[PDB]
Design a protein around this motif. Structure first.
Motif, PDB file in Angstrom:
ATOM      1  N   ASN A   1      -9.220  -4.880 -93.608  1.00 57.95           N
ATOM      2  CA  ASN A   1      -9.238  -4.667 -95.086  1.00 57.95           C
ATOM      3  C   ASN A   1      -9.674  -5.942 -95.832  1.00 57.95           C
ATOM      4  OD1 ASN A   1      -8.327  -1.788 -96.025  1.00 57.95           O
ATOM      5  ND2 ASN A   1      -7.194  -2.257 -94.140  1.00 57.95           N
ATOM      6  N   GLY A   2      -9.918  -7.040 -95.105  1.00 56.34           N
ATOM      7  CA  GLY A   2     -10.397  -8.306 -95.685  1.00 56.34           C
ATOM      8  C   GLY A   2      -9.326  -8.957 -96.548  1.00 56.34           C
ATOM      9  N   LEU A   3      -8.102  -8.995 -96.048  1.00 53.86           N
ATOM     10  CA  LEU A   3      -7.062  -9.858 -96.630  1.00 53.86           C
ATOM     11  C   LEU A   3      -7.589 -11.292 -96.604  1.00 53.86           C
ATOM     12  CD1 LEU A   3      -4.384  -9.178 -97.806  1.00 53.86           C
ATOM     13  CD2 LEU A   3      -3.306  -9.775 -95.620  1.00 53.86           C
ATOM     14  N   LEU A   4      -7.483 -12.011 -97.721  1.00 51.24           N
ATOM     15  CA  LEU A   4      -7.931 -13.419 -97.827  1.00 51.24           C
ATOM     16  C   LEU A   4      -6.717 -14.323 -97.627  1.00 51.24           C
ATOM     17  CD1 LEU A   4     -10.401 -13.274-100.890  1.00 51.24           C
ATOM     18  CD2 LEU A   4     -10.934 -13.241 -98.448  1.00 51.24           C
ATOM     19  N   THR A   5      -6.909 -15.479 -96.999  1.00 53.73           N
ATOM     20  CA  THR A   5      -5.901 -16.561 -96.997  1.00 53.73           C
ATOM     21  C   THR A   5      -5.941 -17.264 -98.362  1.00 53.73           C
ATOM     22  OG1 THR A   5      -7.472 -17.949 -95.790  1.00 53.73           O
ATOM     23  CG2 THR A   5      -5.882 -16.739 -94.482  1.00 53.73           C
ATOM     24  N   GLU A   6      -5.014 -18.197 -98.580  1.00 52.45           N
ATOM     25  CA  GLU A   6      -4.972 -19.047 -99.794  1.00 52.45           C
ATOM     26  C   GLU A   6      -4.826 -18.155-101.031  1.00 52.45           C
ATOM     27  OE1 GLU A   6      -4.475 -21.981 -99.344  1.00 52.45           O
ATOM     28  OE2 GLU A   6      -4.781 -22.883-101.372  1.00 52.45           O
ATOM     29  N   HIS A   7      -4.069 -17.076-100.877  1.00 54.09           N
ATOM     30  CA  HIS A   7      -3.716 -16.082-101.920  1.00 54.09           C
ATOM     31  C   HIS A   7      -2.203 -15.905-101.872  1.00 54.09           C
ATOM     32  CE1 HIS A   7      -7.991 -15.483-102.232  1.00 54.09           C
ATOM     33  NE2 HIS A   7      -7.800 -14.583-103.227  1.00 54.09           N
ATOM     34  N   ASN A   8      -1.538 -15.940-103.033  1.00 55.23           N
ATOM     35  CA  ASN A   8      -0.060 -15.770-103.155  1.00 55.23           C
ATOM     36  C   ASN A   8       0.241 -14.273-103.228  1.00 55.23           C
ATOM     37  OD1 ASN A   8       2.058 -18.250-103.678  1.00 55.23           O
ATOM     38  ND2 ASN A   8      -0.098 -18.803-103.929  1.00 55.23           N
ATOM     39  N   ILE A   9       1.338 -13.839-102.618  1.00 55.98           N
ATOM     40  CA  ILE A   9       1.794 -12.428-102.724  1.00 55.98           C
ATOM     41  C   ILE A   9       2.518 -12.273-104.058  1.00 55.98           C
ATOM     42  CG2 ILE A   9       3.236 -10.647-101.694  1.00 55.98           C
ATOM     43  CD1 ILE A   9       2.558 -12.040 -98.959  1.00 55.98           C
ATOM     44  N   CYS A  10       2.068 -11.331-104.883  1.00 53.66           N
ATOM     45  CA  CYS A  10       2.638 -11.102-106.224  1.00 53.66           C
ATOM     46  C   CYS A  10       3.540  -9.870-106.186  1.00 53.66           C
ATOM     47  CB  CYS A  10       1.559 -10.956-107.282  1.00 53.66           C
ATOM     48  SG  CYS A  10       0.718 -12.516-107.641  1.00 53.66           S
ATOM     49  N   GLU A  11       3.084  -8.776-105.570  1.00 47.72           N
ATOM     50  CA  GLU A  11       3.827  -7.487-105.496  1.00 47.72           C
ATOM     51  C   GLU A  11       3.641  -6.851-104.111  1.00 47.72           C
ATOM     52  OE1 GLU A  11       1.985  -5.334-108.673  1.00 47.72           O
ATOM     53  OE2 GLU A  11       2.897  -6.546-110.222  1.00 47.72           O
ATOM     54  N   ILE A  12       4.569  -5.970-103.739  1.00 52.47           N
ATOM     55  CA  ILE A  12       4.516  -5.163-102.485  1.00 52.47           C
ATOM     56  C   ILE A  12       4.983  -3.737-102.811  1.00 52.47           C
ATOM     57  CG2 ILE A  12       5.558  -4.857-100.217  1.00 52.47           C
ATOM     58  CD1 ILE A  12       5.674  -7.982-100.067  1.00 52.47           C
ATOM     59  N   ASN A  13       4.118  -2.756-102.578  1.00 46.39           N
ATOM     60  CA  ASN A  13       4.305  -1.392-103.123  1.00 46.39           C
ATOM     61  C   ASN A  13       4.812  -1.566-104.559  1.00 46.39           C
ATOM     62  OD1 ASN A  13       3.645  -0.026-100.463  1.00 46.39           O
ATOM     63  ND2 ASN A  13       5.397  -1.315 -99.902  1.00 46.39           N
ATOM     64  N   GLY A  14       4.000  -2.220-105.396  1.00 45.50           N
ATOM     65  CA  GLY A  14       4.194  -2.367-106.852  1.00 45.50           C
ATOM     66  C   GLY A  14       5.530  -2.984-107.217  1.00 45.50           C
ATOM     67  N   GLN A  15       6.241  -3.536-106.233  1.00 43.22           N
ATOM     68  CA  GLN A  15       7.543  -4.211-106.419  1.00 43.22           C
ATOM     69  C   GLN A  15       7.332  -5.721-106.466  1.00 43.22           C
ATOM     70  OE1 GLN A  15      10.822  -2.588-104.172  1.00 43.22           O
ATOM     71  NE2 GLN A  15      11.210  -4.668-103.420  1.00 43.22           N
ATOM     72  N   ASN A  16       7.442  -6.339-107.637  1.00 50.18           N
ATOM     73  CA  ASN A  16       7.352  -7.813-107.786  1.00 50.18           C
ATOM     74  C   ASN A  16       8.273  -8.500-106.757  1.00 50.18           C
ATOM     75  OD1 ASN A  16       8.079 -10.467-108.546  1.00 50.18           O
ATOM     76  ND2 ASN A  16       6.999 -10.165-110.495  1.00 50.18           N
ATOM     77  N   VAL A  17       7.772  -9.541-106.077  1.00 49.39           N
ATOM     78  CA  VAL A  17       8.483 -10.279-104.987  1.00 49.39           C
ATOM     79  C   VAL A  17       8.247 -11.789-105.123  1.00 49.39           C
ATOM     80  CG1 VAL A  17       8.412  -8.316-103.420  1.00 49.39           C
ATOM     81  CG2 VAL A  17       6.579 -10.004-103.332  1.00 49.39           C
ATOM     82  N   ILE A  18       7.918 -12.250-106.319  1.00 53.16           N
ATOM     83  CA  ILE A  18       7.606 -13.687-106.538  1.00 53.16           C
ATOM     84  C   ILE A  18       8.922 -14.467-106.643  1.00 53.16           C
ATOM     85  CG2 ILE A  18       6.513 -15.307-108.119  1.00 53.16           C
ATOM     86  CD1 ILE A  18       4.675 -12.844-108.874  1.00 53.16           C
ATOM     87  N   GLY A  19       9.174 -15.368-105.697  1.00 47.49           N
ATOM     88  CA  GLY A  19      10.343 -16.266-105.728  1.00 47.49           C
ATOM     89  C   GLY A  19      11.359 -15.909-104.661  1.00 47.49           C
ATOM     90  N   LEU A  20      11.304 -14.677-104.141  1.00 44.93           N
ATOM     91  CA  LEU A  20      12.102 -14.250-102.967  1.00 44.93           C
ATOM     92  C   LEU A  20      11.720 -15.166-101.807  1.00 44.93           C
ATOM     93  CD1 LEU A  20      11.839 -10.346-103.278  1.00 44.93           C
ATOM     94  CD2 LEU A  20      13.395 -11.934-104.424  1.00 44.93           C
ATOM     95  N   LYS A  21      12.691 -15.566-100.984  1.00 42.90           N
ATOM     96  CA  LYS A  21      12.455 -16.473 -99.834  1.00 42.90           C
ATOM     97  C   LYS A  21      11.550 -15.731 -98.842  1.00 42.90           C
ATOM     98  CE  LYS A  21      16.771 -18.999-100.728  1.00 42.90           C
ATOM     99  NZ  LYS A  21      18.210 -18.631-100.709  1.00 42.90           N
ATOM    100  N   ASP A  22      10.821 -16.464 -97.993  1.00 43.86           N
ATOM    101  CA  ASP A  22       9.795 -15.867 -97.086  1.00 43.86           C
ATOM    102  C   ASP A  22      10.463 -14.752 -96.257  1.00 43.86           C
ATOM    103  OD1 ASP A  22       7.387 -17.266 -98.005  1.00 43.86           O
ATOM    104  OD2 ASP A  22       7.932 -19.007 -96.762  1.00 43.86           O
ATOM    105  N   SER A  23      11.682 -15.007 -95.763  1.00 47.32           N
ATOM    106  CA  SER A  23      12.509 -14.044 -94.984  1.00 47.32           C
ATOM    107  C   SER A  23      12.573 -12.698 -95.720  1.00 47.32           C
ATOM    108  CB  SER A  23      13.891 -14.598 -94.711  1.00 47.32           C
ATOM    109  OG  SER A  23      14.501 -15.076 -95.900  1.00 47.32           O
ATOM    110  N   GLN A  24      13.029 -12.703 -96.978  1.00 46.32           N
ATOM    111  CA  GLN A  24      13.171 -11.464 -97.808  1.00 46.32           C
ATOM    112  C   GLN A  24      11.836 -10.740 -98.018  1.00 46.32           C
ATOM    113  OE1 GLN A  24      14.927 -13.603-100.891  1.00 46.32           O
ATOM    114  NE2 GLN A  24      16.378 -11.973-101.442  1.00 46.32           N
ATOM    115  N   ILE A  25      10.717 -11.462 -98.071  1.00 49.03           N
ATOM    116  CA  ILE A  25       9.412 -10.779 -98.273  1.00 49.03           C
ATOM    117  C   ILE A  25       9.147  -9.992 -96.986  1.00 49.03           C
ATOM    118  CG2 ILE A  25       6.941 -11.086 -98.737  1.00 49.03           C
ATOM    119  CD1 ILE A  25       7.775 -13.505-100.539  1.00 49.03           C
ATOM    120  N   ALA A  26       9.496 -10.553 -95.826  1.00 48.63           N
ATOM    121  CA  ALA A  26       9.278  -9.914 -94.507  1.00 48.63           C
ATOM    122  C   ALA A  26      10.131  -8.645 -94.412  1.00 48.63           C
ATOM    123  CB  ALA A  26       9.590 -10.885 -93.396  1.00 48.63           C
ATOM    124  N   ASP A  27      11.407  -8.744 -94.802  1.00 52.57           N
ATOM    125  CA  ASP A  27      12.334  -7.582 -94.882  1.00 52.57           C
ATOM    126  C   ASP A  27      11.559  -6.415 -95.500  1.00 52.57           C
ATOM    127  OD1 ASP A  27      14.340  -9.279 -93.927  1.00 52.57           O
ATOM    128  OD2 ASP A  27      15.533  -9.264 -95.797  1.00 52.57           O
TER     129      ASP A  27
END
Length: 191
Positions: A123-149
């Motif tokens: 799908n051409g995911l780019l590096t050097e890009h911050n994750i802002c949302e996941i299934n339209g759920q904002n996740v900015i500031g959650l620890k890396d562990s919680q984003i993986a959850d």
């Protein structure tokens, strides 16, 4: 990200809060923070949205302070804002392998490598890009562990809203990364 300019109409809560921090970027005003439960979240304002107008005034060239000043003097009842949807962002749709992998690595919410022969690759995911949302759920500031959850406990379709890191850094500048975790709306949207 949507393609359109939308009107939203706002109502200051009982404490005269709307739940928004605004940041000046390239002579625009962009959404830096949406407070959980605020009026801003109810009308469905999002991190990275552009505010084009407040009460039909153009925001072109305002300081972050003048934006915040303007807001603090609105005629209370009704605030019209003209919004451009997350103009600095993009959405990628991917499908986990049986192992439950979309197929990339991240650190401090930033994609750092794509794994060969993966949905992220395909799908051409780019590096050097911050994750802002996941299934339209904002996740900015959650620890890396919680984003993986959230990635584990999502369906086989994963939808990731990303932002070029340089632009992500320029937006969150002057907001220590504990208010990022503490008070950024992480909740799924209400209906």
């Amino acid at each position: 990200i949507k393609q359109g300019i939308r009107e939203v109409i706002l109502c200051k809560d009982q404490d005269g809060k709307i739940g928004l921090r605004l940041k000046s970027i390239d002579n625009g005003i962009f959404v830096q923070l949406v407070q959980a439960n605020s009026p801003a979240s109810l009308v469905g304002l999002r991190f990275g949205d552009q505010v084009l107008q407040i009460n039909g005034e153009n925001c072109a060239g305002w300081s972050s302070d003048k934006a915040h000043k303007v807001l603090k003097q609105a005629f209370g009842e009704k605030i019209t804002m003209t919004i451009r949807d997350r103009p600095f962002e993009r959405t990628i749709t991917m499908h986990k392998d049986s192992t439950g992998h979309v197929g990339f690595i991240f650190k401090n919410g930033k994609i750092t490598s794509i794994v060969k022969d993966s949905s992220a690759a395909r799908n051409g995911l780019l590096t050097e890009h911050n994750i802002c949302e996941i299934n339209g759920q904002n996740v900015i500031g959650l620890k890396d562990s919680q984003i993986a959850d959230i990635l584990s406990t999502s369906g086989t379709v994963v939808t990731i809203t990303i932002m070029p890191a340089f632009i992500f850094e320029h937006i969150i500048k002057r907001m220590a990364p504990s208010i990022m975790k503490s008070l950024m709306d992480h909740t799924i949207p209400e209906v």
